Design a protein around this ligand. Structure first.
Ligand SMILES: CC(=O)N[C@H]1[C@H](O[C@H]2[C@H](O)[C@@H](CO)O[C@@H](Oc3ccc([N+](=O)[O-])cc3)[C@@H]2NC(C)=O)O[C@H](CO)[C@H](O)[C@@H]1O
Length: 153
């Protein structure tokens, strides 16, 4: 009646594991920057969608907002940052993350790392965030492990 969810955010690598199986992994040297989003079915844990939005670059946050607004309430929503996710994560996107209950997402800054697991329509199940200490540095890798309650019947 639970999912064991692991979410990793760092400068050079992201991954998400569900019940000990890796369902998302990106350690490619020159791609995959931004906020990785995975959507799970809330009863089975099956992956319903996988996206990456390069919110270091303009317009990607707009795509993220349009995608997240079509996600059903009650899906499991997982986010994790590779390299940089904040430069063009602008106010509408930050307000949407705030509306999910995220604490770190609306506050995300330059080269911060961030891992998030929540029910789309509330509540938040797990969140971690490491602030970058300097413009030339990155946040510390963060590894969030969270038991997510499953729906039944
Ligand atoms: C060497 C390297 O990391 N290059 C990769 C490049 O990395 C981008 C990086 O995504 C962004 C965000 O962290 O930062 C760029 O670096 C700077 C450096 C200085 C400033 N400044 O305002 O003074 C801003 C950004 C970095 N680019 C460089 C040249 O270091 O990203 C591309 C696309 O992902 C490749 O991955 C490349 O490998």
């Amino acid at each position: 009646r639970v999912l064991d969810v692991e979410v990793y955010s760092s400068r050079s690598k992201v991954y998400v594991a569900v019940d000990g199986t890796t369902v998302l992994e990106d350690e490619a040297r020159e791609q995959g920057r931004g906020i990785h989003v995975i959507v799970l079915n809330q009863a089975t844990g099956h992956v319903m969608a996988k996206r990456v939005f390069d919110t270091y670059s303009p317009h990607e946050d707009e795509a993220m907002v349009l995608f997240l607004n079509m996600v059903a309430p009650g899906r499991v929503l997982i986010c994790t940052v590779k390299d940089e996710g904040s430069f063009h994560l602008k106010d509408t996107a930050k307000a949407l993350l705030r509306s999910l209950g995220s604490q770190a997402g609306p506050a995300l800054g330059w080269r911060d790392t961030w891992a998030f697991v929540g029910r789309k329509g509330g509540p938040v199940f797990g969140e971690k965030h490491s602030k970058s200490p300097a413009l030339s540095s990155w946040g510390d890798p963060v590894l969030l492990k969270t038991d997510v309650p499953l729906s039944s019947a």
